[PDB]
Design a protein around this ligand. Structure first.
Ligand code: OGA
Ligand code: MG
Ligand code: NI
Ligand code: ZN
Length: 331
């Protein structure tokens, strides 16, 4: 069995190997990459996502989210308070203000320490989940707005034709902005490209051990667990590495830098934070190996998780028994 320790693998495809996306995902899996839950892909030196970023300040963040924490430093939840719209230019200035800027620090490790120590005492503002793309239309390789769609994968594998579309989303971050512990909708893959700016630190639990994280989360957030049998679908809970190590949960960590892709694999729980102002683009995708995970994915039916239009068909076709209850929580 390849990668039996479930380490995060880092790949350096050549320009030739960068031509066929599906093939390269399958290659990474042949090497055991999926066992980690997360992989890093460093693009060939000849590749570029776009010519320059010189013209991004006019993008609108219609609903910036202030991430307010409750709990203790290592075990907390966050809620998103909606703020008034602002442009990327405005947001970048805000990120660089004395209130919100990255503090002095020695290296990524020192900054990680300061994040876990101090996150809960501040409420950073995140421009998340903005439909759009920053890939140039002429970028042919690993262009996240030109991937094969999940609908088309399900059609090719299973023969059924469904509604729905699959488009990318932009994420504008600042110091301390946080993504809570989650897997993807329907335990899909995700791919995330860091277009510009400061790094993003990731934590991941191997898919084969995801249920260990779920059991710990039920212990640590006991009211949330009573409210919903899939409450990590709410995307609100944070658990630090120290707490994970105290409780014997297998995990790994890695820092993504601008110009780098990350792939999360089906049922790979992940969480993380941004180091300073940055912009990422991400999208879900499927492969044939995903279908069995889609069939088994937990679902929130309490009403909190509320997701996209396209998840309907996935639930309806892959999880017909659950469909009625899940849709009640959607409506
Ligand atoms: O970048 C972020 O805030 C969160 N991204 C992801 O969870 C992902 O790409 O799957
Ligand atoms: Mg612009
Ligand atoms: Ni994710
Ligand atoms: Zn729920």
């Amino acid at each position: 069995a390849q990668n039996p320790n479930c380490n995060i693998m880092i790949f350096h495809p050549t320009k030739e190997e960068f031509n066929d996306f599906d093939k390269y995902i399958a290659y990474m899996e042949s090497q055991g990459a999926h066992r980690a839950g997360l992989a890093k892909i460093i693009p060939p030196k000849e590749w570029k996502a776009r010519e320059t970023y010189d013209n991004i300040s006019e993008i609108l963040i219609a609903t910036p989210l202030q991430q307010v924490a409750s709990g203790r430093a290592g075990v907390f939840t966050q809620y998103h308070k909606k703020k008034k719209a602002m442009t990327v230019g405005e947001y970048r200035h805000l990120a660089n203000s004395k209130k919100y800027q990255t503090p002095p620090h020695q290296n990524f490790e020192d900054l990680e320490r300061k994040y876990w120590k101090n996150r809960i005492y501040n409420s950073p503002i995140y421009g998340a989940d903005i439909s759009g793309s920053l890939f140039d239309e002429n970028t042919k390789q690993w262009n996240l707005g030109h991937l094969g769609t999940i609908q088309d994968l399900l059609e090719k594998e299973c023969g059924v034709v469904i509604e729905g579309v699959n488009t990318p989303y932009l994420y504008f971050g600042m110091w301390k902005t946080t993504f809570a512990w989650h897997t993807e909708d329907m335990d899909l893959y995700s791919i995330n490209y860091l277009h510009l700016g400061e790094p993003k630190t990731w934590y991941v639990v191997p898919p084969e051990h995801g249920q260990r994280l779920e059991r710990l989360a039920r212990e640590l957030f006991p009211g949330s667990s009573r409210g919903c049998g899939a409450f990590l679908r709410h995307k609100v809970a944070l658990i630090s590495p120290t707490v994970l190590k105290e409780n014997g949960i297998p995990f790994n960590r890695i820092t993504q830098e601008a110009g780098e892709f990350m792939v999360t694999f089906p049922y790979g729980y992940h969480a993380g934070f941004n180091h300073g102002f940055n912009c990422a683009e991400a999208i879900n995708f499927a492969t044939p190996r995903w279908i069995d995970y889609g069939k088994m994915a937990s679902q929130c039916s309490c009403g909190e998780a509320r997701v996209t239009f396209s998840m309907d068909a996935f639930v309806r076709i892959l999880q017909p028994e659950r469909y009625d209850l899940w849709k009640r929580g959607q409506d």
